[PDB]
Paper text:
For that purpose, we have soaked crystals of EcoDMT with Br-BIT and oBr-BIT and collected multiple datasets at a wavelength corresponding to the anomalous absorption edge of bromine. Whereas we were unable to detect bromine in the anomalous maps of oBr-BIT containing crystals, the majority of datasets collected from crystals soaked with Br-BIT displayed a single strong peak in the anomalous difference density at equivalent positions, which aided the localization of the bound inhibitor. In this structure, EcoDMT adopts the same substrate-free outward-facing conformation that has previously been observed in datasets of the protein in absence of the inhibitor. In this conformation, a funnel-shaped aqueous pocket of the protein leads from the extracellular solution to the substrate binding site. The inhibitor is bound at the base of this pocket as defined by the anomalous difference density that constrains the position of the covalently bound Br-atom and by residual density in the 2Fo-Fc omit map that was calculated with phases from a model not containing the inhibitor. The omit map of the EcoDMT Br-BIT complex displays density for the aromatic ring and for the isothiourea group located close to the metal ion binding site (termed proximal isothiourea group), whereas the other group (the distal isothiourea group) is not defined in the electron density reflecting its increased conformational flexibility. The aromatic group is stacked between α-helices 6 and 10 contacted by the side chains of residues Ala 231, Leu 410, Ala 409 and Leu 414. The proximal isothiourea group is located in a narrow pocket in interaction distance to the conserved Asp 51 and Asn 54 in the unwound part of α−1 and to Gln 407 on α−10, which were shown to contribute to the coordination of transported metal ions. The distal isothiourea group is located in the wider entrance of the cavity and might thus adopt different conformations, which is consistent with its undefined position in the electron density.
Residue numbers in the entry: 13 to 506
Write the structure that this text describes.
Amino acid sequence: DLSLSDINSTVEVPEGHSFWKTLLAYSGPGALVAVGYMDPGNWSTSITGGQNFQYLLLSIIVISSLLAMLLQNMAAKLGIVCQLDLAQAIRARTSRRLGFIFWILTELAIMATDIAEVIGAAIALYLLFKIPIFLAVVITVLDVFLLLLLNRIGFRKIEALVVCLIFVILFVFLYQIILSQPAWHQVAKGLIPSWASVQTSPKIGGQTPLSASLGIIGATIMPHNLFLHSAISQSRKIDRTDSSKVAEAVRFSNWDSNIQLSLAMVVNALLLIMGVAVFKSGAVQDPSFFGLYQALSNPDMVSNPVLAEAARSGVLSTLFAVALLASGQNSTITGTITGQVIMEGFIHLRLPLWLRRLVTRLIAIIPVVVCVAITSHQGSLDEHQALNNLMNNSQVFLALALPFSIVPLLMLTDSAAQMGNQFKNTRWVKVMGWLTVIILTLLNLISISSQIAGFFGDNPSSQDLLLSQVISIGIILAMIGLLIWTIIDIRRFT
Ligand SMILES: N=C(N)SCc1cc(Br)cc(CSC(=N)N)c1
């Protein structure tokens, strides 16, 4: 009847005032969430923003990282304090019908992340092992056995394995930046929160600063990682009777998550400065993973003689495919964990890790294999671009499910009926939290129509444009209705 009954309150080792050694024990939950923020679903958008506004959007990365840290800290606090995950809190403060709606929505969000992971991983297979595109997908489907072997390891090592993957994809891109020898003075200048980023004056590659900046901002949090954090934060036993120990545990999880998400922000910055320093101005014409592979494998695309020699030696691209693999391994873990969390919390369905990963991977690869079928039937022509378009269209479910995950979390963490007058949110975070929640919900409701219209490709059918407008208005109004319903229920609780 409690979240993650298998590893809930497993190891609690806070000894005296030796926080650091204690810090070393529970450092796992942060990495599991951070690694999700390093998925290839936005690798191109970082390199693209870099080429279009070199070292300019680096401050937006920092701000988005700060906001994600804020919301993930709120989720970890809810988990730590109430000894229950966000799904459970929401399902208990709301009817089964809304619980089921949220369940399906977050299933679709984790499935979109899984589609991105499978596409990136199958393409990484294609590139590294030259496995046929269609076989790389059916090979990635074999991650259920990797999950079986992963089940017997334990979180002291599983979370360390996630840290291993994190540093893998981090050093892969830091090595190529070390060889680039970029102008770190312009990097520090970009990291400042300048107003050039919010302006609309430059229009490089049909992308203005305000557009790329707002996209980074709206793309701040991942709804499934909220639930993941509120569930994994309970893996450390807490007495829930000593305010000093619970406030200490809050500091623990905060420092952990902030380290890990800082690692993630550093990875995003590395992607941006990768697009700026490594690649030549506008060299990247194909955002696809294959596009970036050949661009890193073509010496005329780099901006340094050393990088030219290395790219001709065919290393930069291989390290990129490796990072693709390291990033696609994330879903197998976190998607399963978070999906189990959301099932067992929203619909009270106890399923094993066997049939979970199976159904998720199948539903994810269905569209992938359909896309591959259609493109290879047109002759593997634009097959990688079509895969990237699928990857990017999948990301609409995240916009669909984000409010129904952030508004409830903020409400339940601010209410004393859930946290008490001692551990509720400060007046400081009350303002920042609500501001960020409003901003993101607005941006995502906006992006709903953009994505729905992008479903019809870059060919604007006049009759299909009005249909897209109708569908988008309907979806945004339905989300508005669901949001006000959830607000009413939660405020009735509080
Ligand atoms: N890195 C990832 N796996 S998701 C980044 C992200 C998160 C949300 Br939430 C919404 C969007 C789409 S924002 C748009 N419609 N332009 C993107």
